[PDB]
Amino acid sequence: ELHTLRYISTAMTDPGPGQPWFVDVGYVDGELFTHYNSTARRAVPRTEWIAANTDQQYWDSETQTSQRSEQIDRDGLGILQRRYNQTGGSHTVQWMYGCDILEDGTIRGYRQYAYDGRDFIAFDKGTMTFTAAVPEAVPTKRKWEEGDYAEGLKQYLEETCVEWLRRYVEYGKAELGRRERPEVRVWGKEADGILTLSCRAHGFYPRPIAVSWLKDGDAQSGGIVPNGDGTYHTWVTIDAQPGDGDKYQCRVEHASLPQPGLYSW
């Protein structure tokens, strides 16, 4: 019942050889569904369901917004380097924005910026305020507090963003609402007089999962990481005494599983 629409953009002075310096992507319920970069200079679909339900004018419009955003960040990288008295080197602008539909029907919206990986400025739509995290952000705040910008941003976050999120989840309802069962493997290794038990869940969807080690009824988790195909992976290990392998069970909680799975080494 919770749905999320999130857009992020990165502007880099040093993306690496042959790499685009400006990259943006959009996510619906955590699934990547659109992308733009400064090399191809086109906003493109990244799921079947967005491509099937949009048209040429949609992608021309998204492309126009990204291209305009690209130019403003090209300017911004220079503006900020001059504000910071920087003359070269590796610098990055990042921003992310979007909206959430909460399980109670209430709506969240946000838009925030970072320079060189730390907070720069952020918008609070409910109060129409900007928080400048550093002094170099204050001249920006002064501009963004004037003109049409903040009322328009508030309206986008509360109305346009939510309206589009509702469209997208309808377009993608089949794929977004599916369940895929993880294939679980338990694996053990003994080194330095310690038995390390690994429990891996392969290829589950949706993202939320709980994997834990129970002893007889201090775990390290790699978090939830993506596969190439829209499914997810997690690994959880625990350190045990050698010979105690029989005492441990890996428990897997997932929406696709009517009852949690319990796996032995």
Binding site: Y7, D24, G26, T34, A43, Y58, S61, E62, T65, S66, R68, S69, I72, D73, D75, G76, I79, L80, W95, Y97, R111, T140, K143, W144, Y149, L153, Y156, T160, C161, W164
Partner: peptide, 8 residues
């Protein structure tokens, strides 16, 4: 749909 930013 995306929302452009404005001049820094």
């Amino acid at each position: 749909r995306r929302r452009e930013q404005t001049d820094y």
